[PDB]
Input
Amino acid sequence: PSLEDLLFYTIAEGQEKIPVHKFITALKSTGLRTSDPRLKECMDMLRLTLQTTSDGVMLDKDLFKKCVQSNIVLLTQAFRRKFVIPDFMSFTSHIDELYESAKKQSGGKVADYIPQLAKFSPDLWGVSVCTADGQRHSTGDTKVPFCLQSCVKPLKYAIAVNDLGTEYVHRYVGKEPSGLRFNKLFLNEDDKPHNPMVNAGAIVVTSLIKQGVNNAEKFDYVMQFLNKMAGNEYVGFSNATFQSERESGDRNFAIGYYLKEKKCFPEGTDMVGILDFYFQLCSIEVTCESASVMAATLANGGFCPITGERVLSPEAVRNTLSLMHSCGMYDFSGQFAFHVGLPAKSGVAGGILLVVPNVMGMMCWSPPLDKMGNSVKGIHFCHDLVSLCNFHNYDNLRHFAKKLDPRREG
Amino acid sequence: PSLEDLLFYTIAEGQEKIPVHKFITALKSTGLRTSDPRLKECMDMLRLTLQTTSDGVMLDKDLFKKCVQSNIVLLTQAFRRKFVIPDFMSFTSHIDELYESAKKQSGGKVADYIPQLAKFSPDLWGVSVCTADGQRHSTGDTKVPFCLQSCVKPLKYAIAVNDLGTEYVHRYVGKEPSGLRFNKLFLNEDDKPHNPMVNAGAIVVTSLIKQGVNNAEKFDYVMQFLNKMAGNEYVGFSNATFQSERESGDRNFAIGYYLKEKKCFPEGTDMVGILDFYFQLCSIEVTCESASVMAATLANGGFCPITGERVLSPEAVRNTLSLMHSCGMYDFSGQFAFHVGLPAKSGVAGGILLVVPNVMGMMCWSPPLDKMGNSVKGIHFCHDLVSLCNFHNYDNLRHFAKKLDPRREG
Amino acid sequence: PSLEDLLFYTIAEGQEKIPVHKFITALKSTGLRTSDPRLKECMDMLRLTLQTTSDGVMLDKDLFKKCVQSNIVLLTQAFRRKFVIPDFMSFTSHIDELYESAKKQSGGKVADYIPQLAKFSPDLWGVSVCTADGQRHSTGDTKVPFCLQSCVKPLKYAIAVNDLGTEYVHRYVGKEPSGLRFNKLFLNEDDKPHNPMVNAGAIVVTSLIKQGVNNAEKFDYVMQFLNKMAGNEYVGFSNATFQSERESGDRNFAIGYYLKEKKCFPEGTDMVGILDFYFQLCSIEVTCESASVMAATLANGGFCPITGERVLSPEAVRNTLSLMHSCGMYDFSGQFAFHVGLPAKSGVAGGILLVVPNVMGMMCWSPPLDKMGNSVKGIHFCHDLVSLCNFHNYDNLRHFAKKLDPRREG
Amino acid sequence: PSLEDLLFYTIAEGQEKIPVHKFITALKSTGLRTSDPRLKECMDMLRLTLQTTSDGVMLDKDLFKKCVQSNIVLLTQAFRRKFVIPDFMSFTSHIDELYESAKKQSGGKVADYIPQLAKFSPDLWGVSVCTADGQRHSTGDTKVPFCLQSCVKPLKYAIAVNDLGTEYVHRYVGKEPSGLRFNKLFLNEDDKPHNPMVNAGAIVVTSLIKQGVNNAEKFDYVMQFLNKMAGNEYVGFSNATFQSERESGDRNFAIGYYLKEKKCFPEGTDMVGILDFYFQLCSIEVTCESASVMAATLANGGFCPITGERVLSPEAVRNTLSLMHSCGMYDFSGQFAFHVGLPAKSGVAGGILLVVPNVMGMMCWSPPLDKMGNSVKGIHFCHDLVSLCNFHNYDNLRHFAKKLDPRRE
Ligand SMILES: O=C(Cc1cccnc1)Nc1nnc(NC2CCN(c3nnc(NC(=O)Cc4cccnc4)s3)CC2)s1
Ligand SMILES: O=C(Cc1cccnc1)Nc1nnc(NC2CCN(c3nnc(NC(=O)Cc4cccnc4)s3)CC2)s1
Output
């Protein structure tokens, strides 16, 4: 016996050779993408042999085995229906009506704080899925770049905990939501910002990453880090949005100066420089496809699902997902933690970085904000998602009424 | 083939009959207890045949089939390692070290608010486990009764949601934590108490249960409900602490009068009576074993693990562990949700009703409280439990560092 | 060939004969109810032959032919999927999600003008469907009686036109919406009330039905008419709300006196009597199921869908849905006609008698009104219904984007 | 089996030749025209073969399948009587007497506001039909050009909603009829014009189409759009009527200035320029044949029936037909909505752009207006049309007394 031939016969279906197109649509139907980095040796040796013998698209038992030999384990799990969502193509059908039912929520106002987020169309709306096994799906404006704005706050918090540890990082920032009037206090009773998901806490966290080095290297360090979270998909930077947050952030200068007064940074901090490094991290660009892999990295204990690389410590991922649970959606956070129960994080460009732990990561994006600062279609979509599947933090995996469980068979 | 004899041959050893004592120690090894209600028919048929032959206590393939036939389904998955914790014997050993390393915490103050919760010894300490499949283990003072006090707050909330629905119940009480700033206000900004786990909201929740009938019937109904949650194990009532909580609750009279003047009850409420019903519900007695079954009912989507009866709707259990996560441990709730990540609920008698969703339910009890009102040994124990197993709400089930996962084998 | 044998084998599945329950569940799957009046000969001879041999309960070619022969035309088209909605069982599933998402609409104020509409619970909520072919479905509090109030205005208008004709009836009442400046004037520029759906016009309409006869017979005639419109389902009368609307309708007395002054009644009118008759018609009781059949008569050209009886002339049906289109939802009529595009009529009890011409009739009921006077959940439902299917008056039956069309197969 | 011969055998009538005229008159009898754009490949190859062996007008089994092969789907539905109106030739017979009894309205007065609508004869009267499947018929003066005047309001409203969407567009214009003591207020209570079908509302919608660009491009953009709506039939422009409407529209200037005062345009609007663009859009020319195809695109969910192209989004068509229902016939709208129940739009030149949804589009035209501004022969025709068939918005498709159903056999 051998898994290469075991896999060979499962696609061969009693015939003696496999057309390679029949193999890739079998592959593409599992939800994997042929561009997947863990499939690259196999696609290399398929493209080589559809050159080697350009006659017959067809593959004998060793022509198949020489091609899938080096990734065979991940193709067995794909074809033996062992991915976390086994019937991925029903799931994407469901994603599609969830996307298309959120698509007709009219309302919201595009953030017009700066000329750069007024430049985005209200009818843009994209959602991208990446599961803990690399299965992907997108619908809508998923390859359109936009800035994370404060979707970067969990990502930089995780990096800070990864290099520094929870105890150090939480000498300087709290771990609870403020209370839903204190939309306007900077510090809790211990003179620490309430948590890493508010501006005062984010600014303090930004002050802890890669100390002792200038703002050019730190930005690279976070970008090197954000690159691996996305399995090297698109992570960019829009200098346009940086310059306009550069002279329209009197609040962050207010927070920055208030924090310097009450001695909330580590010794030797250049506060004004930390604000610029902060403003830059907010102008970093992604698409929903790029970002959903970042989200799935958090869904997968800190391992990038499409590379197998250890990006974040499990301690870092854990803290980041518990604070996104409770403080991730501005004033809607408690309502969100009750009704949706998923770690999510919103940003003013229209992003919602969503994580369904142990299953998948997501990014939803539509620029029209509601009156608390959260993308309207994102909020609607994430409600309909939990109303349809047992993904809520406190749904039961055995008795879940008439919800769906994409993790299961029939 | 047939499952009854298959089970016969796995116990029989290739030998020709099974001593009845070896069947029961094999049974107890899975963590079940012979008193299990879903095992009643099978233990009935053992007591019948241990009358027939008062020596020759060994059992045929056929007579083994005679007793186990009618509970064979849950006896096989018991013996095929298909319970949520398959190696239950080691897990309780680990529970045992956790219990006995928490046992050495000197500190804490026994509640002396009343002559009845001060009359309890500081050295009592009991921990009880019930898994979603019915496996049980206890260590320490697990069978001595004590009152839930405000461990009953999630339970009566669940009942309320069960009968009325989330939308009705949350016309009258919020669903967010108040904030470690607004721990001293009675109402949120919408003139509703912040959440069902603080006295102002609990009192309001108590006013919604089974309206239109007098307080004697109401108490009976909550007691019937608490009976099903515990699989008909011990739930009692201490008239002593009822009289001493009626004699010292100017706190609740203040809250009640404020809620009654401010139009926060449903119309036709006899507020002063509701306070008595409220005081009554807090004086209800349990043991840690009884209460852990109550807890496991919540861990199990609303099905009592030792009877299989659907007690609470999944909507009620989901909401109840969602509010226990964010508002369950008084001012320690945010620190608790961060470090422990389990829905828990504390009470001044020394109780912590703990839930590991999809795994197990628990009750720890030791009357010495810390200065936030939480049992000292209870808090220490749940820190050590999550520090040892990947039970935290946002641990990953695949990559989890140096933690242990009792759900798996080798 | 034979129409009965053809049906026999289509259900028999090639097997022996048909268990009587298999035919009955097959029947209910088309959406008809065994209570259907045009099915009653077939059900008479079903229980007639289930006394024949108290156990079979299986049915030959010629005993199946024995029962269905006399309704065979209506049963084959039901079983040949030829009703206006062929796959009725998903459609009701969809109605079910529509009902359950509107059920979460918090808002509204229950009418407290009278002690009789304040007595209703804010959470009562029912929706029920009857198609032009008699297929029925219900969800929620559909069997609870409530008064039509001014849902009766289209019905009595229809009665009036049926007996007198369009030209006579519109000597006394207009046929346009007044305009959202003239929501508060009684007469249009021709000294006629603007249309039959506002109180002055309804009051005038009440003055033309069965003139020359006393008010006791007049009420009987309208009740006989409403009986036929509902296929003899529930139509009642609340003398409480009648007595309470006559003691508090100074508005209507003002209207009556003004119309009497300006000579807007037919000669020989006892105006004060017509007001009493008008108040009576507003206190007529229905349930959502009864009233939805009334609606379905209007969807069906004036033929009762569950009896085949011609109740209203097509001239009356056209005009009444033409006026319900433009003047039916008080001040919300123009906004409703735009977005919903369905003839509807709202009433203060919380009813919306809604009609999808050529498809189905409906009645939704929830007592919370919004501040234009229309049931909140009723309005939300009719928004989502049209947001989901191509039922809007000026949707296209061929190119309709991603809307659904329950009228079609695949 | 295969469709070309199934069609061949249905026309051949068991015989072995088809004269080409027998196929073509069979074709016209369905109401299609040989000029139909979705038939031109079949007609190109038809007289190609009446050139190849140009004596012998007859068609073998293989020669018929060479000619009809690329348009076969639309040729079978035509011949299997599967168009929305199957007996088109009786229906047009009915259209003929409906036209001919309306020819008998003496009355009305021709618009003489400008010398260009006074130059038209009161006895001009044309009606043209285009069904949602492209079947056509006309009677009378159907090839005579005239301007849309305010027949353009539904068309440009649709263009705006197609590009802008319902919610944006109705930030600037209401969606209700005002009420008929209020044929004279400019703005409703939210300071928006009542609806896109009155001059103040139309002027505002004209201000939302293709903002930020010059007036020549804007006009071209609307002209390209109207061209697709008519399947590239006649859409013109009367520069004469433009000069006389810019010369005599002080109320529109009155309206324009009032709307400027009350902040009713989007920021950066050159109002006086928007009026000029508005005056141009009103002087755009059509015939009743061209215009009936425009109507049928609205009858057909936004697809031009004689080209198959998607021109308007289904949302745009829906909104434009709801507002033509209720505000389309000036002060006569409510009476028209009641008795006729069809989305229609009238114009000062004498046109009525009529739509029977899911069936057909129409344009009736006779310049004599009545005292509310609607062509008398137009209004009379549309009463008798609905008086004869179950086309009213709230007729029943199953029980309709003694009316006709041209949709049925
Ligand atoms: O006469 C015609 C025909 C016609 C055609 C052409 C020219 N003229 C007449 N129609 C009429 N029908 N009913 C009439 N008499 C009623 C007296 C009782 N109501 C009221 N009276 N006063 C009121 N005040 C306010 O509402 C305050 C307010 C708020 C907002 C706007 N305005 C006012 S409401 C209704 C009127 S007149
Ligand atoms: O006000 C709002 C908001 C609003 C809407 C609705 C209710 N409440 C508030 N909208 C407005 N739209 N237009 C306005 N001003 C223009 C002034 C120029 N015209 C005229 N002037 N005078 C005129 N009367 C006559 O011709 C003859 C006549 C007849 C009857 C009585 N009296 C006189 S028409 C056009 C209107 S205000």
Chains B and D do not touch (no CB pair under 8 Å). The pocket of QAJ (ligand 1) is lined by residues C 184-187, 189; D 181 (CB under 6 Å). Chain B is about 45% helix and 10% strand.
